[PDB]
From a paper:
The structure of crystals grown at pH 9.0 was solved to 2.8 Å by molecular replacement. A starting hexamer model was constructed by docking the coordinates of the ExbB monomer cut out from the pentamer into a low-resolution cryo-EM map of the hexameric complex. The asymmetric unit in the lattice with space group P21 (Supplementary file 1-Table S1) contains two ExbB hexamers, one disposed upside down with respect to the other, and interacting laterally with each other. The overall hexamer structure resembles a bell with a vertical dimension of ~110 Å and a maximal horizontal dimension on the cytoplasmic side of ~85 Å. A Fourier difference map revealed untraceable masses, probably parts of ExbD TM helices, inside the channel of the hexamer. Low occupancy and possibly flexibility may account for the lack of clarity. The ExbB monomers in the hexamer show similar structures to those in the pentamer (the average RMSD of Cα atoms between two monomers is 1.4 Å), despite the different subunit number. The channel in the hexamer is significantly larger than that in the pentamer. The diameter in the hexamer is ~17 Å and that in the pentamer ~10 Å through the TM region. Neighboring monomers of ExbB in the hexamer and in the pentamer bury approximately the same surface areas (3000 Å2) and the residues contributing to interactions are also similar. It is not obvious why hexamers crystallized at pH 9.0, but the negatively charged amino acids in the acidic cluster at the cytoplasmic end are further apart in the hexamer, and the channel radius is particularly large here. In the crystal, each ExbB subunit is settled on a flat plane parallel to the membrane and well follows the six-fold symmetry normal to this plane.
The Ton complex is composed of three proteins ExbB, ExbD and TonB located in the inner membrane. It utilizes PMF to take up diverse compounds such as iron-loaded siderophores, haem, and vitamin B12 through outer membrane receptors. ExbB has three TM helices with a large cytoplasmic domain, and both ExbD and TonB are predicted to have single TM helices and a compact periplasmic domain. ExbB and ExbD together form a proton channel, and isolated ExbBD complexes show ion conductivity and cation selectivity in vitro.
Numbering used by the authors:
A (entry chain C): 10 to 232
B (entry chain D): 19 to 233
C (entry chain E): 11 to 232
D (entry chain F): 19 to 234
E (entry chain A): 10 to 234
F (entry chain B): 20 to 234
C-alpha cells in the first residue's frame, strides 16, 4: 500500500488531517529553503563588513571604508545613525548626551533587524506546536471508529477493530512528519537569529567605540 | 444521550463561537492600529526638532498614539516652564512615556486571556466528558453483570467523541492566541521606538538650547 | 445520580469525593467574594486616576483627593509624599527627597499587591493537587478491580466494572475541582498584575508632581 | 508479601511522619516570628528619626529582628565616626541590611529541602514498588507457566497499593512545602520593608545633619 | 527471584542495560559520600571564620584574626585579595578606584570557588538525564521479545508474554533506581553550593565594608586634622 | 519496508554527524584549554600592564590571553591624547567582554547538532515504529485475521526502530553535556583573564594620574 492508497481508504476526517499536515510540511520546507539562503548571504556580507571596519581608527575612516558597502548594507545603516546624531547635535556642548543618544539609537536598530529576521519563524513555531494536537485528534477519532465497528458488527476481534486502529496510527505518523522538522528548523533559525544579532551588535559596538573616542579627543583639545 | 456529556459538547461549541468572534473583532482593531502607527513612525522619522515633530503630527487625529506621546512631552515642557534643571525635564518625560507605552500594551491584550484559557482547558473539559461517559458504561456493566464489550461500544464511542470536539475547540484558540501575542509584542516594540524618537528630539533640543545660552 | 454514585462507592472514594466537592465549594466562594472586591477597587482607582490627572501641582492633587475616603489608595500615596516632605523639612538635598519618596511608593504599591493576593494561595493548591488526589482514586479503583479478580477467581468485564467505575469517578471529580481553580487562579493573578500597574501609574503621577514642584521651588530661589 | 515492596511502604510511612513533624515545629516558629515582626513594623512606623526608632525598639527582645537591623545601622554610624562621606555611610548600611535580610530568608528555609524531596520522590518510589511487584508476578507466571490472571491478582493489587501510599505521602509534603515557601517570601518582603524604614530614617537624619552644619 | 538470578535469565541486551545502570548508581552514591563530607567540613570551617571576622573594626584587625586560619582558608584568600589591591594601588589618589577593583576581584573569586564546588555535579546531571533513556530502551526491548514469543510459540497467552514483560519491567525499575537519586542529589548539591556561595559572599561583603570604611576615615583625617 | 529502512539509514547518518562533532571538539578543547591555566598563572604575578605584556611576549600569535592584552594596548594607543581616563577604562571593558562572548559563541559550534540529534533521534525511531504497526493493522484489515501470532513478527520489527533510535540519541546526549560543561568552564576562565587585563589597565591609569597631580 502507497500513501495515496492509504489516503483513499481513510475516512473524510483523516483525509483532511492528511491534506492539512502535508500542506503544513510543504510550507515548513519552503520557509526553510528561502530563509537558509537569506541568512547565508547576510552573514557572509556582515562578516566581510566587520573585518573591513575593524581596521578603522576614527569614525571618519569607518565612513570611508563603508562608502562602497551598498545601500542595503547593515553596517552602513549603523554608521549613518551615528552621523545623523552628530549632524542634528551640531552646536551642543554635552558630548555625553551625543554618546547616550547614539547608543540608544543603535541598540533599538539592532533589535528591529532581529525582529525582521524572524518573519517566518512564527509559522514554524505554530506548525511544530499544533501538529501533535491534530495527530492526537486523529488518534482519538481513529479509536472511536474501532468502537463504532464493534457496535455495528456486535463482534470484538482484531479484524473489526483494525481499520480504526490503522487510521489512528496514520494520524500519529503524519503528525510526527509535520512536527519534528518544524521544531528542529524553528530552533536552528532562532539560534542563527541570536548569533546574527550578536555579530550586528559587535559592529554597532565598534561604531560606538569610534564615536566615543573621537568626541573624547576633541573635548581634550578644547580643555 | 448523557446530560453531562451533552453539556460538555454545548460548552465546547460555545467556546469555539467565542474564539472566532474574538478573532474577527481583534483582527480589525490590530490591522488598523498597526498600519496607522507604521505610517506615523515613517513621517516622524524626518523630524529634526520636537517643534518640527509637532508640525508633522498636527493632522494625525485625536485618537493617534504618536500624537499622545508628543502631547506628553509638550505638557511636561509647559508645566516645567521656569525650571533650571533640564535633566529633571528629560527624566520626568521618559518616566511618563515608559508608563503610557506599558498602559497601551495592557489595553491591546484585552481578549487574549479568553483565547489562552479556551486553548488550555478545552482538551481537559473534553477529557472530563469521555471519563464521565466511560464511567457510566462501567456502572452499566456492574448493574447488568455484562460480559460482552459490544453492549458498551456505542457509549464508549460517544464518550471518545467529547475528546475529539475538545481538541477541535482548543487548536484554533491556541493558534489565534499566539498570532495576537506576537502582534501585541511587535506593536509594543514599535510604539516603544516612536516614544524613543519623541525622547531623542526633546533631549537634543534641551541640550542645543542650553549651549546657545552658555555662549 | 451523583448521590447514587457516592452511596455505591468505597469509604476511600466517598472521602476523596467529599474532599474534592468541598474544594470546589471553596473555589467558587473565593471567586464570588474576590470578583466583587476587585471590581469595586478597580472602579474606584480608575475614577481617582482621572480626577488626579488634572493636577498641576502636588498641593492641587491633595485638594482633589481631599474627599476620596480614608480607605482610598491614591490618598495613601499622596500622604506618603507629604509625610516625606514634612520629615525632610530643613534639608538642602532635593534629590534625596525624590529618591526616598520613590522608594516608599514602590514598596507601598508592592505591599498592596501582596494584600490583593490573599486567597489565591488556596486556588493554586486546589488546582495543583486536585489532579493528584484524582490519580490516587484511579490507582485505588484499579487496585479494587484486581481484588475483585482474586476474590471471584475470574477475569471478566463484570468482575472488574465496580473498580473501573470508581477509578473513573475519581478522575471526573478531580477534573471538576482542578479546571475552575486553575482558570480562576490565573484570571485573578492577571487582574492583580493589571491593578498593580494601575496603582503604579497613580504613584508615578504623585512622583512627577513632587519632582516638578521641588525643581520649580529651587529655580525661584535662584 | 514482598520485601522490596514492604521496604517501600515503611519508607513512605516514615516519610509521612517526618513531613508532619517538620510541619508542627516550623508552623510554631514561623507564626511566632511573623506575629512579632508585624507588631514591631507598626510601632517603628511612628518614628520621625533613627534615634526615636531606637527608643521604640528598646522595649523589644534580644532575639528581635527589627532590633538587629537598627543595631546594624548604629554599628555602621559608630565605626564611621569621623568620616566626611555621608553617602559612603548610607551605601555601607544598605549593603549590610540587604545581605542580612537575605541571610534571614535562608535561615527560615531550613527544613523545606526535606519537604521538597519527599513531595517530589514519593510518587516515584511508589511507582518503583508497583513495577517491582508486578515484575515478580510475571516472573512467577513464566516459572509456573500459568494462564489464569486470578492466580496473580493478589500480587498485582498489593503492587498497585505502593503507588496509592506513594501519592498519600507526596500530596501533604507538596502542599506544606508551597505554603511555607509562600510564607518565607511574604516574611522576607515584610523584613525588607522594616530594613527600608531603618534606611530611610538614617538617610534623612544624615541629610538634615549636613544641612544644619552648612548653615551655622 | 534474586537480582543476580534475574540478571542470569535475561537477554545479553537486558544484561548490558542492567550493568550500565548499576555502574551509574555506584558512581552516583560514590560522588554523594565524598562531596557530602567535603561540603560539611568546608561550611563548618567558614561558619567559624565568619563569626570570628564579625568582631573586626578595621581591615588590619581582620588580618590579625585571620592570621592563623590556615593556607587553604577561604576567608584568608579574600583578605589577601583586598591587601594585594591596596599594595599594588600604593600611590593612588583615587580611593573609589581601589574599592571598585577590590569588589570586582572578590565577586570573581567567590564565583570561581562556586565553580570548584560544582566538580562532580556534571556526572550527576548526565546520569539523571540518560538513565531514563537506557531504562526506556530495556522496556522497548522487553516488550519486543514478548511479541517474538507470540510469533515463535504458535500460542498467545499470559505465560508466552511473561518473560518479555518481566524483562521490560526490570529495565524500568533499574532506570528509576539510577535516575531518581541522581536527580535529587544533583539538586541538593546545587542548592548547597548556592547557599555556600551566599555565606562566602557575606564574608567577602565584610572584607569590602572594612576596606571601604578604612579608606573613608583615612581620607577624612587628611582633609581635616 | 522502504519507510522503516529510511529511518535506520537516517539514524545511521545521525550517528555519523555525532562522530564528526565528537572529533572536531575533542581536538579543539585538548589543545586550547590547559594552555589558558598556564597563561592565567603567569599573568597573575604581573604588577603592571607593561609587565603583563612582557610575560605574554612569548605566548604565541594564536594565544587568547595575548589577544585580550593587545585589545587593551590598541585602546591606549588609539586614545593617546585623551584626558578622560574613565572613557579609556569603559571602552576597554566593553571590547574585552564582547571579545570573551564572541569566543564563547565560536566554541559552541556543533553543540546545536548534538542537542537536536539527542532530542529528536527517539522521535524518528517512534515514527518508524508507528509506521510499522500501522502496516500490520492495514494487513489485518485486508486479510480479516483474528490471530495476533500472524502479526507479531511485524510488531517486534517495528518496536526495534524505537530501540535503535534510543541507541543513536544516548551518545549525542552524553557528548552534548560534557562539551556544554567544558565551554562554560572555559568562558569563565577567559573571563577571569580579561578581568585581570582590566584591573592592570585601571590601576595603571590611576597611578599615572596621581603622579601628574603631585610631581
Amino acid at each position: 500500500l502507497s500513501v495515496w492508497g492509504m489516503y483513499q481508504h481513510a475516512d473524510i476526517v483523516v483525509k483532511c488531517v492528511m491534506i492539512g499536515l502535508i500542506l503544513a510540511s510543504v510550507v515548513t520546507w519552503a520557509i526553510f529553503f528561502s530563509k537558509s539562503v537569506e541568512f547565508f548571504n547576510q552573514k557572509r556580507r556582515l562578516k566581510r563588513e566587520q573585518q573591513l571596519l575593524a581596521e578603522a581608527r576614527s569614525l571618519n575612516q569607518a565612513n570611508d571604508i563603508a562608502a562602497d558597502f551598498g545601500s542595503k548594507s547593515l553596517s552602513l545603516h549603523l554608521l549613518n545613525e551615528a552621523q545623523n546624531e552628530l549632524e542634528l547635535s551640531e552646536g551642543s556642548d554635552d558630548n555625553e548626551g551625543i554618546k547616550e543618544r547614539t547608543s540608544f539609537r543603535l541598540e533599538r536598530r539592532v533589535a528591529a533587524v532581529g525582529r525582521q529576521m524572524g518573519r517566518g519563524n512564527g509559522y514554524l513555531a505554530t506548525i511544530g506546536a499544533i501538529s501533535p494536537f491534530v495527530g492526537l485528534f486523529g488518534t482519538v477519532w481513529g479509536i472511536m471508529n474501532s468502537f463504532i465497528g464493534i457496535a455495528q458488527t456486535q463482534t470484538t476481534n482484531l479484524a473489526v477493530v483494525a481499520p480504526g486502529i490503522a487510521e489512528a496510527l496514520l494520524a500519529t505518523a503524519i503528525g510526527l512528519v509535520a512536527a519534528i522538522p518544524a521544531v528542529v528548523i524553528y530552533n536552528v533559525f532562532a539560534r542563527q537569529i541570536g548569533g546574527f544579532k550578536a555579530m550586528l551588535g559587535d559592529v554597532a559596538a565598534q561604531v560606538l567605540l569610534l564615536q566615543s573616542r573621537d568626541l573624547d579627543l576633541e573635548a581634550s583639545a578644547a580643555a
